[PDB]
Design a protein around this ligand. Structure first.
Ligand SMILES: [Mn+2]
Length: 596
């Protein structure tokens, strides 16, 4: 933290001074990403009452939020473009709520800024955060400058991105301007809740791609405030990608090594509550196989000169949902979050540790709890101890299975892309697409019952139909080594309501099959929905009782209904903006189902 801004290049300096004149902060501080700066930020945050130390652990801290500021606010998140059709398809003609993004006109956007930002930082320091999305020297990396009046945001951006000097050395006119304020100028006219400033009634999270700009007001929380995380890495980036010939995706990236020494990388898009982080840092249950984590949320991908799809993880840390995390379910995540971690809205224990539903850290008898609301809590309370969207924010380099190339500037070659879902019936354990367009259809048809195409539903940066067109166009690249495309479902249930598939480390068996398919192996049989593993070619050795026929249902009734639902979904939500090739795939599936 320094008041000297002379190291900022001209365009970055211009942006900072614009924000200063608008927001009227008490002082202006340039962040350098150093260890000493982190200690300073922590001290101020503890003094402000925002952070509780967690003396059970090594340098971990707990923040709590105002109950009105606990998650991304989709209804207040908007794309700002001169033409509405550049941002979103036509409104559902039957009058249903728009579900592929919100549009705000430039006129309306500017008027909204003018109601909110003038003088919003009075009495507060403004912090300048120069940051890189990706290793700063990667050809796939992109820079930003975020200004904010939240030390909490500064601390978390330091973890989630690359911040400081090394970024400054690369900074020119080409960066994303990221303007943030909690919207609580001093003096306060009423007490805060949990020392957490916000302006919930006026929250606005705006994306202005034509201006390389993100503007976020009134929330201090994760997806709204850490502008690299979703605003930049998916919304702004997806539009850049469409214009510049790459892909910015809501995908984990992992490396899979066979017992015989070959390594393949795979990306996977999962909607919420499908075990995304459990897959990305899985400990495999097939002897000889290794899994490494490259990232568990965002993937930026571009074809190289040889036609290989190269991916980087543009983030430097994990901002993960805490509830459910345990040594039983994810020992790698437990190791990642054991030190130098900021927890938000989890429970606090009398022994100075944390608590959330599912946590299995041994604790002494007589240990007691305080909920994320600051109230005493005991098991059986109608409310959870930790908020369901409570988070850890931890450096990625603490994950024991980080891939050796997780921060390699060249990126890793992707040979499979996996779409995920959670269905009790109908959708097989694993299916491979018959080709590129068929796979793009599978991605567009993902569910979460809600539809979540490519797991991008809340994160489109431009017309979702045109994003599907971009995916189709991408497959036409001359001499591209296109990854094979798959859809997986870990969550089929049997007649008794128990899972047919044990999941977790056994998911490695599904990755092993996919690995073999990448290798050109003759291990599949055709079905109306795509290729499935032949019985015997999916390794079920050591899984006695697991019933192959239950893992690969082929139910005509289910698919007839699924087709009806998709047709209605496409018609209402994409209309004329749906690419013909996608509709053609639905029509093909319909005809194949007719003959089954
Ligand atoms: Mn995500």
């Amino acid at each position: 933290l320094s008041t000297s801004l002379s190291a900022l290049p001209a365009a970055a300096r211009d942006f900072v001074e614009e924000a200063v004149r608008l927001c009227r902060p008490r002082e202006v501080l340039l962040c350098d990403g150093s260890e000493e700066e982190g200690k300073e930020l922590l001290r101020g945050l503890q003094d402000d009452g925002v952070l509780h130390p967690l003396p059970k652990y090594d340098n971990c801290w707990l923040a709590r939020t105002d109950p009105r500021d606990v998650a991304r606010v989709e209804s207040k998140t908007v794309l700002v473009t001169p033409e509405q059709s550049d941002a979103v398809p036509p409104p559902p003609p039957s009058g249903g709520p728009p579900q592929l993004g919100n549009w705000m006109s430039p006129n309306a956007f500017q008027a909204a800024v003018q109601e909110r930002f003038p003088g919003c930082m009075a009495g507060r320091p403004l912090y300048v955060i120069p940051f890189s999305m990706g290793p700063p020297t990667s050809p796939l990396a992109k820079l930003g400058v975020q200004v904010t009046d939240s030390p909490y945001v500064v601390l978390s951006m330091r973890i989630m991105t690359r911040v400081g000097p090394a970024v400054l050395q690369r900074l020119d006119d080409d960066f994303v301007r990221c303007l943030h304020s909690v919207g609580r100028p001093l003096p306060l006219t009423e007490p805060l809740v949990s020392s957490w400033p916000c302006d919930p009634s006026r929250v606005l999270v705006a994306h202005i791609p034509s201006e390389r700009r993100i503007v976020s007001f009134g929330s201090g929380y994760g997806g709204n405030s850490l502008l690299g995380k979703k605003c930049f890495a998916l919304r702004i980036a997806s539009r850049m990608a469409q214009q510049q010939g790459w892909l910015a995706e809501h995908m984990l990236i992992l490396g899979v090594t066979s017992p015989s020494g070959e390594k393949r990388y795979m990306a996977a898009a999962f909607p919420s509550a499908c075990g995304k982080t459990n897959l990305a840092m899985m400990t495999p249950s097939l002897p000889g196989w290794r899994i490494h984590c490259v990232g568990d949320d965002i993937a930026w991908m571009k074809f190289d000169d040889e036609g290989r799809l190269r991916a980087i993880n543009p983030e430097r840390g994990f901002f993960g949902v805490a509830p459910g995390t345990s040594s039983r379910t994810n020992p790698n995540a437990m190791a990642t979050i054991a030190r130098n971690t900021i927890f938000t809205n989890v429970g606090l224990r009398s022994d100075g540790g944390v608590y959330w539903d599912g946590l299995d850290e041994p604790t002494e008898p007589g240990v007691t709890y305080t909920s994320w609301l600051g109230k005493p809590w005991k098991h059986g309370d109608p409310e959870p101890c930790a908020h369901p969207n409570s988070r850890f924010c931890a450096p990625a380099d603490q994950c024991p299975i980080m891939d050796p190339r997780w921060d390699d500037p060249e990126g890793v070659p992707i040979d499979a892309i996996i779409f995920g879902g959670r269905r009790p019936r109908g959708v097989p354990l694993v299916v491979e697409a018959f080709g590129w367009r068929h796979g793009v259809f599978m991605g567009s048809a993902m569910r979460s019952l809600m539809h979540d195409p490519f797991a991008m539903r809340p994160f489109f940066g431009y017309n979702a139909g045109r994003y599907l067109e971009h995916w189709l166009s991408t497959g036409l690249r001359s001499n591209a080594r296109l990854p094979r495309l798959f859809h997986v479902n870990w969550f089929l249930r049997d007649n008794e309501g128990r899972f047919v598939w044990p999941g977790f480390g056994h998911n490695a068996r599904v990755l092993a099959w996919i690995f073999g398919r990448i290798q050109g192996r003759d291990t599949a049989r055709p079905t109306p929905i795509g290729w499935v593993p032949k019985e015997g070619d999916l390794d079920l050795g050591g899984l006695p009782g697991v019933d192959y026929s239950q893992l690969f249902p082929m139910e005509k009734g289910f698919w007839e209904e699924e087709c009806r639902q998709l047709r209605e979904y496409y018609g209402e939500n994409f209309g004329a903006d749906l690419p013909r090739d996608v509709m053609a795939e639905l029509e093909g599936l319909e005809e194949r189902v007719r003959k089954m």
